[PDB]
Write a protein that binds this ligand. Structure first.
Ligand SMILES: [Mg+2]
Ligand SMILES: [Zn+2]
Ligand SMILES: [Zn+2]
Lengths: 96, 237, 104, 421, 46, 67
RNA sequence: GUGUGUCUGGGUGGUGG
């Protein structure tokens, strides 16, 4: 990291200390079910574990709820890349 | 079937359930196996049905002979129809434990008739006998059951066909070997103790030896009676 | 719906379906195995039979008439690999670990 | 804020109350009774006012039918055929899941009032807006329904062909060979063509794919794959999102990374799509268990009672739904006339019970917890250890009432434990 | 000239001539396999 | 599908050790103890003889294409 | 005492960066 070759201090923190908060569309995990993120949670649970805060690190191991929430965040990143490519391609073609 | 359903529904009073069980016992005494399969062999899940089965088992102990007949019919239906239920198994345990060599004898006669008639019944019968020996551990004497099965209930009738006669001969040979499966949980524990040490529990060892000797005498009698029973008997076998 | 055409007039009705095991024809019919269909580029299909009434009364029963062939998903109840042991499946040059669930 | 309905096979939109009067409700009180169930509530009764002002022109059934029959695709010039077309539309086209034959207009009116009531509940915010990405609001068309959909049109073509053949031969007054009358090749050719190309009907393409035999994992993934037919080129990124409902049903990781992200999906390990089942045992059992049908009840009795839906068709109501749900769960755990895959959901905040038996529903097994204890005990494991010996299978475990299949809609109302500790 | 095929089932050798129906001589199978060539097969044991 | 003749990493011969390993396992020896008894001390060879799948047996179930 | 023709045109699906 300090050499700047690859990685970031955020990667160090996620690996060692805390993965952090998983976000979907800039906000916390939505209530996909009726007033809860997953069926394992009480209705109207706004706590960290219920809304996507991954307490554990990549070393300790994500709990399965945190695994699912992290999967949702990763899916958001992939979709953003997939649509961004075509949109920027057309913009670049018009620009040139 | 009303007895099991009503007893389970009333389960979570005691007198109405006992009265219904007594009425069922009187009907069973009045008294083929389709009704027994529809009532005794119903596979109801809930613990209220378990309480119903316990009440019916107490009634079956009170009505040992008719309960033995109903359990034999239920075992016949279970073997032939290729299905089983926990409640039917519990009723079979109660009937076997209540009356020694009465429910297993008729049940084994029905099983031998079915085995002579249709295949795919020896493995289920062996598993049922092993489960009964492990769980109930009371009056589970398959030796007397096989001995009664050899000639009493439609034994010439079930071996009319060549394939049926071959199935009957194979079933008789299996029952001659099923004496090991007919030992109860006390005999298995005594075998475990003998494995630990052949001299430990000398009185229990002698009791197990006497019971096994009776079973071996029954098996020898079955083997002796099987040869005149089957004309197509193989000499080497 | 029963189709009806007319003077005289007769009614056509289909009642029962009969789907045999997969076969292949040419000479006599023979059952076709999925390996044979894969190698010989055959459609692993089964014939579909129906019985029809043509009442003009003058009721004529066309028992078990061919109407078409339907493809068969492998390892299903109507495929030829149903309920076979591993030894039998290997003897037919089929993989016992294969899950089926596909058409040929 | 007038309410409007888009009736099928009608070019121009229509007011809802005109459809209600056309169904045979000249009066106004019965219509609003079928829509509004709590007459002491004035708010929903307030917003339904601007609709009612459109009733000035139309009170009689005949003129309502004239309105809803004059705007069809084929123009109607005279009275009687317009009335016939409106009757045919209102009998066969709109809302066939409630009733297609006659003597069902009142049930159709009840369902139409219910859906207008649902719209009004959503408008006031009393009811949450439906989410399009919810997996409970989705059905997976497996091989069964797809081949059935092909076979329906294919058999229709076969009947048309034999009709044309018979009509041609009848003009000469001659009998025929029926085997020669059935050109058997069209069914086989259509099934083979659709299976080979993947083009479904005629519109829909890519349904059938060549099995990917690169490796065993590829074959298993291909067989367990499922595709969302939403537009691949679309800019709306909502259906590609990993929705929360996909938990346990759909793998969160397995997805193509190209342009098909979030649209092509793979089943989870325990996921099992429902195969479908008839709802006749449901309906016959319910009437045996104090389910007061719509045809026999007063319309005011549903103000407090809970609606009961079977496969999306509202049939009757119940006064006390708690014990009904308990006994239905008992029947499902006891393997009676109702099968395991039947979904049993009960909305409690809005008094509704919805029973589903149709195919395409996704569900997974789960253990059952009662009194903070696992119904599964050591005895089941001991029996399962001897599974190859005494043929104690997973089916016995299902029949024992220890496990059950929970649909995505049912998963909404369950309280799920991650683990027994 | 005497082309030899191998039945898929019988594993029998059949003298099938050119433009002939592909039929086994015993079971009448439709699928036949060719015998390994005779020219030379040499691999350096790597 | 068949046991490799040589260990990929170091080159110790493990083509002769598959059947002895199976016999030791049939003798109710722990596979760690079985590997120890076969002299495979380096964990490369232990991986070699431990992770192998005997798929040649499954292939032998099929008929030969010519007899 | 030699030597060029290399099935095009669409559609569908999967994949790699
Ligand atoms: Mg790139
Ligand atoms: Zn041959
Ligand atoms: Zn090595």
């Amino acid at each position: 990291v300090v050499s700047g070759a690859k990685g970031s201090k955020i990667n160090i923190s996620q690996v060692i200390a805390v993965v952090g908060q998983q976000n979907v569309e800039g906000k916390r995990i939505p209530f996909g079910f009726k007033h809860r993120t997953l069926p394992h949670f009480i209705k109207d649970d706004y706590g960290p574990e219920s809304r996507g805060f991954v307490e554990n690190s990549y070393l300790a191991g994500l709990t399965p709820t945190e695994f699912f929430f992290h999967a949702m965040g990763g899916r958001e990143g992939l979709i953003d890349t997939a649509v961004k490519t075509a949109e920027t391609g057309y913009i670049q073609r018009r620009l040139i | 079937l009303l007895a099991v359903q009503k007893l389970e529904m009333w389960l979570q009073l005691t007198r109405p359930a006992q009265d219904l069980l007594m009425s069922v016992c009187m009907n069973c005494n009045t008294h083929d196996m389709d009704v027994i399969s529809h009532l005794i062999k119903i596979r109801l899940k809930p613990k209220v049905l378990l309480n119903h089965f316990m009440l019916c088992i107490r009634e079956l102990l009170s009505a040992h002979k008719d309960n033995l007949g109903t359990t034999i019919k239920l075992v016949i239906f279970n073997e032939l129809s290729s299905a089983r239920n926990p409640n039917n198994m519990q009723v079979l345990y109660t009937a076997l434990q209540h009356s020694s060599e009465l429910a297993p004898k008729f049940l084994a006669m029905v099983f031998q008739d079915l085995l002579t008639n249709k295949d795919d019944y020896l493995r289920a019968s062996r598993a049922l006998l092993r489960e009964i020996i492990k769980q109930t551990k009371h009056e589970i004497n398959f030796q007397a059951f096989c001995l009664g099965l050899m000639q009493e209930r439609k034994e010439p009738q079930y071996l009319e066909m060549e394939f049926k006669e071959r199935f009957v001969v194979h079933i008789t040979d299996v029952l001659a070997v099923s004496m090991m499966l007919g030992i109860t949980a006390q005999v298995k524990e005594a075998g475990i103790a003998w494995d630990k040490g052949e001299k430990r529990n000398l009185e229990v060892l002698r009791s197990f030896q006497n019971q096994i000797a009776a079973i071996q005498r029954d098996a020898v009698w079955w083997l002796h009676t099987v040869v005149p029973s089957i004309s197509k008997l193989a000499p080497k076998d | 719906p029963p189709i009806d055409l007319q003077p005289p007039r007769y009614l056509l009705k289909f009642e029962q379906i009969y789907l045999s095991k997969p076969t292949h024809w040419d000479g006599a019919p023979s059952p076709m195995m999925p390996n044979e269909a894969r190698l010989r580029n055959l459609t692993y299909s089964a014939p579909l039979y129906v019985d029809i009434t043509k009442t003009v009364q003058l009721q004529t029963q066309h028992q078990k008439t061919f109407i078409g062939k339907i493809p068969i998903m492998l390892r299903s109840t109507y495929c030829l690999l149903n309920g076979l042991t591993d030894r039998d499946l290997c003897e037919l040059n089929e993989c016992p670990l294969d899950p089926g669930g596909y058409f040929i | 804020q007038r309410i409007v309905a888009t009736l099928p096979y009608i070019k121009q939109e229509v007011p809802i109350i005109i459809v209600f009067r056309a169904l045979g409700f000249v009066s106004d009180r019965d219509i609003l009774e079928h829509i509004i169930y709590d007459f002491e509530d004035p708010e929903m009764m307030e917003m339904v006012k601007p609709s009612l002002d459109e009733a000035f022109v139309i009170q009689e059934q005949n003129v309502a039918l004239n309105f809803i029959g004059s705007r069809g695709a084929k123009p109607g010039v005279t009275k009687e055929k317009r009335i016939k077309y409106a009757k045919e539309v209102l009998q066969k086209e709109m809302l066939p899941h409630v009733g297609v034959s006659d003597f069902c207009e009142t049930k159709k009116a009840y369902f139409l009032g219910y859906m207008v009531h649902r719209l009004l509940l959503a408008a006031l915010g009393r009811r949450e807006l439906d989410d399009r990405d919810h997996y409970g609001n989705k059905r997976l068309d497996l091989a069964g329904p797809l081949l059935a959909f092909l076979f329906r049109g294919m058999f229709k073509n076969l009947l048309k062909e034999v009709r044309i053949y018979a009509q041609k031969f009848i003009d000469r007054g001659k009998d025929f060979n029926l085997e020669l009358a059935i050109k058997t090749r069209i069914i086989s050719d259509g099934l083979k063509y659709s299976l080979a190309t993947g083009n479904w009907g005629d519109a829909r393409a890519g349904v059938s794919q060549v099995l990917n035999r690169l490796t065993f994992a590829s074959t298993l993934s291909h067989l367990r794959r499922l595709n969302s037919p939403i537009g691949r080129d679309g800019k709306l990124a909502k259906p590609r999102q990993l929705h929360n409902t996909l938990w346990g049903m759909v793998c969160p990781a397995e997805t193509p990374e190209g342009h098909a992200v979030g649209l092509v999906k793979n089943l989870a390990l325990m996921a099992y799509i429902s195969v479908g089942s008839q709802p006749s045992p449901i309906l016959e059992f319910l009437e045996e268990w104090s389910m007061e049908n719509l045809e026999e009840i007063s319309p005011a009795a549903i103000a407090d009672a809970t609606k009961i839906f079977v496969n999306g068709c509202w049939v009757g109501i119940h006064k006390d739904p708690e014990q009904l749900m308990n006994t239905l769960r008992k029947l499902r755990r006891q393997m009676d006339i109702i099968v395991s895959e039947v979904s049993m959901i009960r909305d409690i905040r809005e008094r509704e019970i919805r029973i589903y038996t149709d195919a395409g529903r996704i569900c997974r097994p789960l253990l059952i917890v009662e009194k903070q204890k696992l119904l599964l005990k050591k005895r089941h494991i001991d029996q399962l250890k001897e599974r190859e010996y005494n043929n104690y299978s997973w089916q016995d475990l299902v029949a024992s009432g220890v496990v059950e299949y929970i649909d995505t809609l049912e998963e909404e109302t369950v309280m799920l434990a991650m683990t027994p500790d | 000239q005497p082309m030899i095929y191998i039945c898929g089932e019988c594993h029998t050798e059949n003298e099938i001539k050119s433009r002939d129906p592909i039929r086994c001589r015993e079971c009448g199978y439709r699928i036949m396999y060719k015998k390994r060539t005779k020219r030379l097969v040499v691999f350096d044991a790597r | 599908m068949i046991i490799p003749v040589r260990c990929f990493t170091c080159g110790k011969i493990v083509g002769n050790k598959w059947e002895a390993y199976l016999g030791l396992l049939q003798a109710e020896y722990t596979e760690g103890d079985a590997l120890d008894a076969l002299g495979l001390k380096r964990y490369c060879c232990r991986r070699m003889l431990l992770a192998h799948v005997d798929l040649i047996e499954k292939l032998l179930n099929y008929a030969p294409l010519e007899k």
